[PDB]
Symmetry: C3
Subunit: 114 residues, 3 copies
């Protein structure tokens, strides 16, 4: 699993430990060892959501499997929950795009996961 | 709809109302209320197009539906047009990837759009 | 083809000519003229891989065709090889997501490639 957050929240408002917290929580939610989890946070972005530049986020979660209707609802609860608590972003100003990747379409260590 | 532009144009060359203009224009082009529209502009990027670092842009438009052959041609006219007029990027140095997202694969407000 | 790299490696560690090297090597690997190849490098990111902030990268390659099992393995060998040699990122701390884009879903020069 790879989780990216792009947000207009400033860097100083990303708290210490947020990357580890994301990593642990995604491990828990996906059932995957945290060694396999990548996270990426991009603050200070020039963004609007609904025409407004109050705090918002555009995110992606790519995963080889573990993507589907109920799982995605459960990830969205968790992740919006973290972004609200840690970054003070209202859940209704967050979009998270979920991508179920084929193993053959993920490269790693000079090969792919196929 | 979510529209992201990554460009090597500098921040100072992005004009003041550009995020609202993109939002209104996308609202008009997709038939969707502007409350549902997200936009993100990433200037000062290290990029090349055709091996050259003259102004260029890599973009994406994600939408739940409203994606297809004719619609995409129409969005490309509109968006290249805006990027040419506002950011002074030649349309032939712009790529825009279109993604038709399933509602179940877009998270928002602690749940998905399914 | 479009190739994007996000990495926590600092901008000063990206060597001169890296964008042009990426362009040429992708041209060679894909069989596509370098005129149509876009590359984008994003350093200084706030990222973790396996919970660690040692050097890593998250990447993507979008291409209209030229995506598949053996080709992706071959692209991964090349790209991880470059990132190791030029940016000193261990191949086992790189993910590259491959996307086979439909021509109708790629915009360019006020139209699409359909
Ligand atoms: N099976 C399997 C599998 C699933 C995910 C990954 C990479 N980790 C997150 S995308 C690597 C291997
Ligand atoms: N139906 C429907 C629908 C379409 C799009 C969105 C989010 N807005 C842009 S991606 C939310 C719901
Ligand atoms: Cl290039
Ligand atoms: Cl939509
Ligand atoms: Cl991690």
């Amino acid at each position: 699993p790879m989780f990216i957050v792009n947000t207009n929240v400033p860097r100083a408002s990303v708290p210490d430990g947020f990357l580890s917290e994301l990593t642990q929580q995604l491990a828990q939610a996906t059932g995957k060892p945290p060694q396999y989890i990548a996270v990426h946070v991009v603050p200070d972005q020039l963004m609007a959501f609904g025409g407004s530049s109050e705090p918002c986020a555009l995110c992606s979660l790519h995963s080889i499997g573990k993507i589907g209707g109920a799982q995605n609802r459960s990830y969205s609860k968790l992740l919006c929950g973290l972004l609200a608590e840690r970054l003070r972003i209202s859940p209704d100003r967050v979009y998270i795009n979920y991508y179920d990747m084929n193993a053959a379409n993920v490269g790693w260590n000079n090969s792919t996961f196929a």
